Homo-oligomer: A and B are copies of this chain.
Amino acid sequence: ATPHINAEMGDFADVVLMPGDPLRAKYIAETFLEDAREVNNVRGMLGFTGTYKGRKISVMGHGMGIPSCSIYTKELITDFGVKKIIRVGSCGAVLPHVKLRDVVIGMGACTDSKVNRIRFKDHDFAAIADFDMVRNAVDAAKALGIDARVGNLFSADLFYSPDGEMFDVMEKYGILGVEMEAAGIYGVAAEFGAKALTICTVSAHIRTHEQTTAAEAQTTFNDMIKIALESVLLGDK
């Protein structure tokens, strides 16, 4: 019923978890949700709806990059009644003791994209998460006994940057993770009046060159998923 999602109103829950990888979305649905049913396959960007401890929850890929996730998050918000989006992604670390598989929560997201300047008359829009969603994730992580650091992400347009110097700048300003979506989703949420949060798992260290495998990112970043799901239940009250 939308140009990139073959589904109808009601097919999605009012909260959607979104990794960039549709195969991770499939894994999450098969592993964490009961009675999961596929609700989208357009362009292979798989989305599912099921229950978690009785709560109706959806999970769907958003693809890589600001332009990709801006399409899907917009369509979910304006045409599927989605009120909350929780991005559950991977990121690269620049800080010395942020390590592989650490969970980080993006209360804010820097970017080298032009999308928000386009929205905001070429000034600086502070791309931020919903505060209550941030707090729910923090509280859920505490209850699960999982460490999670809250701060700034950097949403990059170029995974392969010609400007390695920017990584030193990011590190100097305390950037917790480099990914490619948070700032765009946060812009969409502000534009169309919904609520968003990005939680990432560290899948690479940009300095040490340590990194997980594609298979590991697809199916073993479960801490962030437990946090995301439990945080929804806290949100419901």
Contacts and interface: CB of A to CB of B under 8 A. Distances in A.
Interface of A: 1, 3-4, 6, 20-23, 42-46, 61, 63-68, 70-71, 74, 107-128, 131-132, 134-135, 138, 150-152, 156-163, 165-166, 169, 172-174, 180, 183, 187, 190-191, 193, 204, 211, 214, 218
A183 to B, nearest CB: 7
B74 A64 contact: no
A66 B120 contact: no
A26 to B, nearest CB: 9
A45 B127 CA distance: 29
A61 to B, nearest CB: 8
B162 A150 contact: no
A119 B157 CA distance: 12
A123 B68 CA distance: 20
Given A44-B46, A64-B43, A119 B156 contact: no
Most buried by B among A65, A119, A134: A65
Contacts of A166: 121, 123
B180 A67 contact: yes
Given A64-B67, A124-B183, 10 more contacts: A65-B67, A74-B159, A108-B126, A110-B125, A112-B118, A114-B157, A119-B162, A119-B169, A128-B152, A131-B150
B160 A121 contact: no
Nearest to A112: B123
Q: Which 3 A-B pairs have the closest CB atoms?
A: A65-B67, A108-B126, A108-B128
B127 A158 contact: no
18 contacts: A23-B43, A43-B63, A44-B44, A44-B46, A64-B71, A65-B68, A65-B71, A68-B68, A107-B108, A108-B108, A110-B124, A115-B158, A118-B163, A119-B173, A122-B122, A124-B127, A126-B183, A131-B150
A95 B173 CA distance: 31
B124 A124 contact: yes
Contact of A172 (B64, B138, B191): B191
A134 B174 CA distance: 18
Contacts of A64: 4, 43, 63, 65, 67-68, 71
Contacts of A158: 67, 70, 115, 118
